[PDB]
Design an enzyme around this catalytic site. Structure first.
Site, PDB file in Angstrom:
ATOM      1  N   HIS A  40       6.826 -44.597 175.049  1.00 50.88           N
ATOM      2  CA  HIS A  40       7.109 -43.201 174.040  1.00 50.88           C
ATOM      3  C   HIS A  40       8.283 -43.632 173.774  1.00 50.88           C
ATOM      4  CE1 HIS A  40       7.230 -39.057 173.291  1.00 50.88           C
ATOM      5  NE2 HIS A  40       7.908 -38.717 174.312  1.00 50.88           N
ATOM      6  N   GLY A 141      11.030 -34.027 180.017  1.00 52.73           N
ATOM      7  CA  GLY A 141      11.895 -35.386 180.419  1.00 52.73           C
ATOM      8  C   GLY A 141      11.503 -35.758 182.040  1.00 52.73           C
ATOM      9  N   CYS A 143       8.996 -38.057 181.604  1.00 52.07           N
ATOM     10  CA  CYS A 143       8.080 -38.913 181.171  1.00 52.07           C
ATOM     11  C   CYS A 143       8.711 -40.299 182.402  1.00 52.07           C
ATOM     12  CB  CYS A 143       7.720 -39.098 180.042  1.00 52.07           C
ATOM     13  SG  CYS A 143       7.176 -41.125 179.388  1.00 52.07           S
TER      14      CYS A 143
END
Lengths: 297, 299
Positions: A40, A141, A143
């Protein structure tokens, strides 16, 4: 006494780094000279379906920034493996712990180190559900936050990298090979996970814990064998019970056969009584956790 | 979403040591050239009352063994302060974090690093209850396990050292000055803690979390002001509510007043029959306002 605990986080904290690509920032895990992070981080800013192969093809190395506690690591090359990137850097992590990579199965417990901008903020124990999601606590945030277990010999098992939150609020991650648990898509979408089953192995472990604390109002005198229970389980939202021999420890002290607990599960499936704080059956704790938390074994 | 979490334990793990005196073993905390541990380590093996002043006067330094991850430290001197000992060792901990000592008050959340033979085995968040006990998970050997908080600037607040389990299962510790929380005795006895009260400030936070998750079947339109609620709370096993303005962030978003939640607590004081709020079947006082705000918004 049963409390969800996490294993200490020190050895894993020293592996968390901040990974940035253009404006996008998330967490990575630095082991030796490799940083693993969710892919991502290279997604374009859009509302259309993300084509990761195209994003990967247009990647520039100089767009990456990888840092540990404000110190910047030189990026040498990047490859894509399923839902993760492996970033080679020009410096090895001198605090890399002895470690292996392990793929979790439903019913497995592990620890989450919740991180933001490369800095750990919280640690908690979770259990992988039958629909391959977890109930974590993550805000924006998180991830790339890692999941781990620590073996008796000190070896860290790296098993999870946080990927996405589903519309239901459930959390989805990958292993370190890039396979997404449950094969969910690692980008925004309308996906709905299948319903969870009750983890029968964990319910049995929990009922043994209550017996070891004198809590036994619920104990059925009769028995169901495993084949009977597994038929009932299919028709009532529970998983099949794995084996009887594992519980021989707890079967000793109590001294209660698994088949008596299987019968109790059928009856308890509390009005309005209570078991170890809970008002319904709990599948949060594994056999290993109960044994470790009660006997240190 | 609400999950009880601990703050990361790495900086505290580097301070945990194994403290042995004769055959007795427990945990200590090594900061600078000082190790703090419960004085239980110098207790004689017996079943009668421990006279710790006598045990201290007959203590000899060579009976101590102190180690960090198997590396033994030399003991230079020892003094007693309430229920702890301060052991001076002949080298400083090169990984001593920036730190202070802070005494908890009931309702404060903190983190426990559960340790055995000087090695950390688990970490979890806890609240100091109104009866000055905590509900931990400790087995034999956890004495001296530390409690801590990590401030935003990175300063570690050392606030708790595990001392004993009461017969009820309740856990009792001291601060690093040696004052036992709740003034329990730091040796086996028949003492019983007082009744736990529901932490009303935490219940208000929990109900705001419910509203922010779209759970509002329970919401009362009635209003009870602070003075009235505190009088009700006295009679119904709840603490007073400390203040209302601290909740204004959540009150603006929801947008429900604290006085409506106070009325809601009174309405939900006995069960939900048989509905749930965020999965709970009765009111939950596990989560502080700070936790709800930090877990929901990162603030």
């Amino acid at each position: 006494g049963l409390k969800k605990m996490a294993q200490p986080s020190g050895c894993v904290e020293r592996c968390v780094v901040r990974v940035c690509y253009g404006s996008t920032v998330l967490n990575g895990v630095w082991l030796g000279d490799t940083v693993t992070c969710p892919r991502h981080v290279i997604a374009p800013s859009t509302t259309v379906l993300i084509d990761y192969d195209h994003a990967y093809s247009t990647m520039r190395l100089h767009n990456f920034s990888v840092s540990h506690n404000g110190v910047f690591l030189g990026v040498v090359g990047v490859t894509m493996h399923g839902s993760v990137l492996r970033i080679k850097v020009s410096q090895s992590n001198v605090h890399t712990p002895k470690h292996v990579f392990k793929t979790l199965k439903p019913g497995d417990s592990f620890n989450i180190l919740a991180c933001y901008e490369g800095i750990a903020s919280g640690v908690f124990g979770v259990n992988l559900r039958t629909n391959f999601t977890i109930k974590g606590s993550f805000i924006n945030g998180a991830c790339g936050s890692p999941g781990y277990n620590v073996r008796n010999d000190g070896t860290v098992e790296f098993c999870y990298l946080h990927q996405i939150e589903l519309g239901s609020g459930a959390h989805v991650g990958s292993d370190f090979t890039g396979s997404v648990y449950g094969n969910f898509d690692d980008q925004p979408s309308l996906q709905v996970e299948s319903a969870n089953l009750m983890l029968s192995d964990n319910v049995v472990a929990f009922l043994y814990a209550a017996l070891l604390n004198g809590c036994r109002w619920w104990l059925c005198s009769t028995r169901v064998n495993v084949d009977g229970f597994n038929e009932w389980a299919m028709a009532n939202g529970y998983t099949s019970v794995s084996s009887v021999e594992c519980y021989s420890i707890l079967a000793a002290k109590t001294g209660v056969s698994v088949e008596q607990l299987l019968a109790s599960i059928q009856h308890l499936h509390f009005g309005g009584k209570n078991i170890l704080g809970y008002s319904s059956l709990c599948d949060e704790f594994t056999l290993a956790e109960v044994v470790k938390q009660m006997y240190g074994v």
